[PDB]
Amino acid sequence: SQVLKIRRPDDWHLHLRDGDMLKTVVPYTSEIYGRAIVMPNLAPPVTTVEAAVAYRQRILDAVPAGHDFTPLMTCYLTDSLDPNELERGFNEGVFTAAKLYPANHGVTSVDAIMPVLERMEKIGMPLLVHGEVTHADIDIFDREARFIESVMEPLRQRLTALKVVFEHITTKDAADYVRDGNERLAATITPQHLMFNRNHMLVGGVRPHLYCLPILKRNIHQQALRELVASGFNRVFLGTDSAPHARHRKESSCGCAGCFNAPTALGSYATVFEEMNALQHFEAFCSVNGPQFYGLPVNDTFIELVREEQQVAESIALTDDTLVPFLAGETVRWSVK
Amino acid sequence: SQVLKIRRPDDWHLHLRDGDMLKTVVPYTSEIYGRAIVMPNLAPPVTTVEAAVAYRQRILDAVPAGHDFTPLMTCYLTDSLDPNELERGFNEGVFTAAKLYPANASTNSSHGVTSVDAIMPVLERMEKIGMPLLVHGEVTHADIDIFDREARFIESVMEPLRQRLTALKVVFEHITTKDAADYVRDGNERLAATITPQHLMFNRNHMLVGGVRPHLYCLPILKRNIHQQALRELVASGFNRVFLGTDSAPHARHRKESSCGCAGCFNAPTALGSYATVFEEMNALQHFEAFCSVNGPQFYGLPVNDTFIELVREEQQVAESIALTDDTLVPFLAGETVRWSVK
Ligand SMILES: NC(=O)N[C@@H](CC(=O)O)C(=O)O
Numbered sequence: 305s306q307v308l309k310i311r312r313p314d315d316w317h318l319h320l321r322d323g324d325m326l327k328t329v330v331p332y333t334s335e336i337y338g339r340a341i342v343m344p345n346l347a348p349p350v351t352t353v354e355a356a357v358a359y360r361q362r363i364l365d366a367v368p369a370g371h372d373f374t375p376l377m378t379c380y381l382t383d384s385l386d387p388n389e390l391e392r393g394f395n396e397g398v399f400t401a402a403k404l405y406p407a408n409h410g411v412t413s414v415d416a417i418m419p420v421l422e423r424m425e426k427i428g429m430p431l432l433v434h435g436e437v438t439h440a441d442i443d444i445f446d447r448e449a450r451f452i453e454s455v456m457e458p459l460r461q462r463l464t465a466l467k468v469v470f471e472h473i474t475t476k477d478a479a480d481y482v483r484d485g486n487e488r489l490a491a492t493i494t495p496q497h498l499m500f501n502r503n504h505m506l507v508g509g510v511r512p513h514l515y516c517l518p519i520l521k522r523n524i525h526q527q528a529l530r531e532l533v534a535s536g537f538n539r540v541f542l543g544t545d546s547a548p549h550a551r552h553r554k555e556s557s558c559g560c561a562g563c564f565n566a567p568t569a570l571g572s573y574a575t576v577f578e579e580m581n582a583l584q585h586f587e588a589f590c591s592v593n594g595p596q597f598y599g600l601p602v603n604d605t606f607i608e609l610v611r612e613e614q615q616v617a618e619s620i621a622l623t624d625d626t627l628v629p630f631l632a633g634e635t636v637r638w639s640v641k
Numbered sequence: 642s643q644v645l646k647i648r649r650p651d652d653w654h655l656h657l658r659d660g661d662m663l664k665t666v667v668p669y670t671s672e673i674y675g676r677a678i679v680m681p682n683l684a685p686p687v688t689t690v691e692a693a694v695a696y697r698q699r700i701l702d703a704v705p706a707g708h709d710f711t712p713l714m715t716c717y718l719t720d721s722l723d724p725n726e727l728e729r730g731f732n733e734g735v736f737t738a739a740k741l742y743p744a745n746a747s748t749n750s751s752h753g754v755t756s757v758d759a760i761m762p763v764l765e766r767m768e769k770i771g772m773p774l775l776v777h778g779e780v781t782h783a784d785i786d787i788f789d790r791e792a793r794f795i796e797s798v799m800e801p802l803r804q805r806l807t808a809l810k811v812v813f814e815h816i817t818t819k820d821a822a823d824y825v826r827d828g829n830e831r832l833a834a835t836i837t838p839q840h841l842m843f844n845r846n847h848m849l850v851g852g853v854r855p856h857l858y859c860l861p862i863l864k865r866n867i868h869q870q871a872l873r874e875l876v877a878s879g880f881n882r883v884f885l886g887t888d889s890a891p892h893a894r895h896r897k898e899s900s901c902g903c904a905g906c907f908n909a910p911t912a913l914g915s916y917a918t919v920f921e922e923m924n925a926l927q928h929f930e931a932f933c934s935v936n937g938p939q940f941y942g943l944p945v946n947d948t949f950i951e952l953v954r955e956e957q958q959v960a961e962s963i964a965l966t967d968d969t970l971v972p973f974l975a976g977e978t979v980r981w982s983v984k
Pocket residue numbers: 319345434515516517518545547548561562563
């Protein structure tokens with residue numbers, strides 16, 4: 305019965321993969337979102353303007369007629385990346401941002417890429433950060449918190465004009481850090497980190513389809529993220545981190561990290577905001593806060609969500625194997641009209 | 642290559658399942674261990690003397706010719722269990738101990754315990770007759786974080802229970818935390834513990850970094866490294882009320898590598914060499930025999946075995962999988978090179 309009309313959203317953190325998987329997954333995004341930040345962690349990664357241009361066209365080829373979807377491309381930062389290559393892609397309108405993955409082709413130190421980061425700061429290119437330390441001796445649940453202290457804060461103190469998105473935050477540590485930051489710091493939050501905590505992944509069985517990075521944390525962290533979005537804080541915004549893997553790559557002796565949440569993310573977010581008595585802040589999170597941070601216009605079309613329960617498919621067909629969507633088989637309280 | 646000769650060990654915490662799975666898994670235990678505590682969590686659970694007798698015989702049927710193996714049976718504690726039935730099974734030598742799984746108010750009374758307070762008549766009977774209680778010490782309330790469930794049990798259940806029933810003998814099964822290590826270390830002659838090979842060898846990082854590894858997923862869940870280190874130090878200390886209990890808990894590969902993987906490591910094939918590796922790494926091999934072969938018997942009031950087995954420090958590869966009638970089992974350390982093996 306209840307209908308909610310919002311400005312068309314964007315997805316500020318998306319994995320589209322390549323090849324046949326790209327063809328399968330793109331429509332779940334392109335049917336809903338005006339734009340998406342397309343992450344560069346292909347094999348091999350997108351580290352040049354030329355690769356980014358070709359990847360963008362493969363994406364556009366897979367977008368159904370009648371969907372007005374624009375992929376915003378990113379550069380995968382590497383220790384040896386030429387700042388001129390990054391800048392050129394920015395100037396050509398190819399790279400919207402650059403993405404920093406901690407090694408384990410990722411970045412091994414901030415110090416190794418200082419000239420690149422200094423160029424980004426100068427030109428006004430946002431830096432998107434997967435904020436975890438990776439030393440083998442650090443417990444996995446501690447890696448996000450540890451990153452703040454040892455990498456993020458020294459970085460932000462060194463390059464004070466650099467615009468940073470703390471991607472897919474999962475902790476009270478990160479939530480407080482972002483809440484207390486300045487207008488050059490923002491964050492994205494996935495639906496899974498709002499909806500669940502580590503118990504949902506581990507109690508009653510191990511659930512690889514809830515296994516993603518940064519790892520689901522303790523309930524107190526989930527609650528902190530929920531309070532953050534619900535507060536109306538305007539430097540957090542929608543980034544699904546939809547990260548699809550074939551079923552038997554997920555369900556194996558060593559399951560891949562990532563939730564394929566593009567089919568269900570928007571309605572899942574609506575449920576969270578509704579539960580937090582915060583639907584007044586829902587549009588901004590989905591459709592305004594991101595554009596404002598990135599300095600891009602808001603979308604000029606509108607969509608409607610309706611509060612009628614849809615069951616999520618058990619699986620989605622691939623050329624080989626299937627794809628198991630996030631919330632497969634379950635019910636979602638809101639759907640797109 | 643180096644040889645380690647020990648009195649034949651026993652496994653004080655074992656799942657043997659039933660039917661065809663039992664037939665496949667029993668030999669991995671019976672070739673090595675003289676005795677094992679056979680857990681009662683069948684479907685339906687072993688809650689009567691008659692079921693335990695029949696289950697014991699199915700286990701004996703599946704022991705290969707010449708293995709000297711004796712299953713020690715257990716009763717699954719439930720709300721509906723008659724204390725007279727438990728006593729009779731103990732008196733008759735059928736039940737060696739009884740096993741308490743986590744309480745849950747929604748459990749069927751035929752299948753488990755609603756709250757510990759509700760089964761005090763059976764626990765009082767065990768205390769009275771000197772029957773040991775084996776405890777899977779977790780609280781499973783939905784609002785308790787899974788990594789906290791063992792510690793919460795100590796505070797909410799274990800300590801009050803032992804204060805209530807001061808003569809009750811208890812094994813804190815498969816301990817996984819420094820909380821439990823300290824608790825058991827600081828306890829009296831009526832409190833003991835078992836520790837699995839996976840909880841000594843690994844911590845939660847091994848299960849979650851670089852991938853999710855369902856073959857390391859078991860209950861109680863692997864904890865952070867500080868807890869692993871506490872467990873290692875406890876066994877390394879020579880503390881004589883900790884002993885070998887594998888919690889070998891086999892599930893078919895398709896039930897492990899699924900959208901909702903079952904909890905349990907099939908470690909019977911590789912457990913003994915794994916414990917040898919841990920004790921060696923802790924420079925504590927002088928305590929290894931006692932852990933495997935002496936401490937358990939002493940706590941249960943049973944004789945130590947009078948035959949010997951030898952482990953050799955020679956590298957061997959663990960099978961990738963072990964055929965079942967249908968599907969396959971993936972052993973603990975599948976495909977790995979291990980340092981110690983049985984001669
Ligand atoms: N988050 C995930 O668990 N997976 C992402 C990587 C990422 O966002 O780090 C992927 O590309 O598979």
